[PDB]
Design a protein around this ligand. Structure first.
Ligand code: IHP
Length: 67
RNA sequence: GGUUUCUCUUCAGAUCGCAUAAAUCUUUCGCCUUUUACUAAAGAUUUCCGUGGAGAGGAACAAUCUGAGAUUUUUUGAGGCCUUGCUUUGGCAAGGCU
């Protein structure tokens, strides 16, 4: 989120250079798309293993003794 | 002596990635009642999204194509011919020859 804010400020301060000001119509999304999808390939297998443990506790039950 | 494409197998040792995330563990911290969740640095590993080379199979389109394949200077007649030594008989070692 800090890198998204920094990319927003970099885009804004490369953009507001001449006659454009701080209006609400600035459009660019590729850098945040890169950041959150590289986060998504990071966060995928931990999510898959946590959801697999969730499904195993849901359907195989909870090992109360267990490990 | 086709191409494109799909699948499988194998080697990935190149920035396999002109890209970049996460997790565990060993720790130092930051934070700090405590548990996950924590902060940012190192070490030790891993996983994921990708990647390259090779081979096989399949499919659709090329249906061949693609290859491979002389007289006149110095690199051709200054060509012939004889005697002695030796014949070792293809002519050889020396002389006058045109
Ligand atoms: O300096 P800017 O890049 O132009 O930031 C401004 C604004 O106020 P400030 O001028 O005082 O900084 C906000 O501040 P920051 O978070 O960037 O510090 C921010 O608002 P958000 O927090 O919602 O992002 C953002 O607003 P937005 O992203 O909607 O454009 C933006 O606003 P403006 O550029 O329109 O003035």
């Amino acid at each position: 989120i800090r890198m998204c804010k920094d990319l927003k400020h970099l885009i804004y301060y490369r953009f507001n250079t001449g006659p454009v000001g701080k209006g609400p119509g600035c459009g660019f999304w590729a850098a945040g798309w890169r950041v959150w999808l590289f986060f998504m390939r990071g966060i995928t297998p931990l999510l898959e293993r946590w959801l697999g443990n969730l499904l195993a506790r849901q359907f195989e039950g909870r090992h109360s003794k267990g490990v």
